């Protein structure tokens, strides 16, 4: 997917936030890895 | 209520810690207790 810069540091578990309130969450014992960069040059 | 719910799970921990060791210390001072009021008990029946 794509988020603004805003809710970048929003993408852990146990955060709250828009995203984290309505969109999209983490459960406490998730195992995996998450990589975000910027694609403000291509969109 | 008021912090982080990871972090609350650490304080937690430590509340945990303490009531098990303080319980452990009870029941390791009840054995002692015991054991002296046993012995005592059988010198009693010997007694009589």
Do not use: H
């Given at each position: 997917f794509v988020i603004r810069g805003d809710e970048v540091?929003?993408?852990?578990?146990?955060q709250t936030g828009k995203i984290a309130d309505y969109n999209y969450k983490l459960p406490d014992d998730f195992t995996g890895c998450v990589i975000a960069w910027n694609s403000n040059n291509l969109d | 209520s008021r912090l982080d719910k990871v972090e609350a799970e650490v304080q937690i921990d430590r509340l945990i810690t303490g009531r098990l060791q303080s319980l452990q210390t009870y029941v390791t001072q009840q054995l002692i207790r015991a054991a002296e009021i046993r012995a005592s008990a059988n010198l009693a029946a010997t007694k009589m």
């Amino acid at each position: 997917f794509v988020i603004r810069g805003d809710e970048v540091r929003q993408i852990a578990p146990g955060q709250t936030g828009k995203i984290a309130d309505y969109n999209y969450k983490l459960p406490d014992d998730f195992t995996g890895c998450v990589i975000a960069w910027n694609s403000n040059n291509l969109d | 209520s008021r912090l982080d719910k990871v972090e609350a799970e650490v304080q937690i921990d430590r509340l945990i810690t303490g009531r098990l060791q303080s319980l452990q210390t009870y029941v390791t001072q009840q054995l002692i207790r015991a054991a002296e009021i046993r012995a005592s008990a059988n010198l009693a029946a010997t007694k009589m």
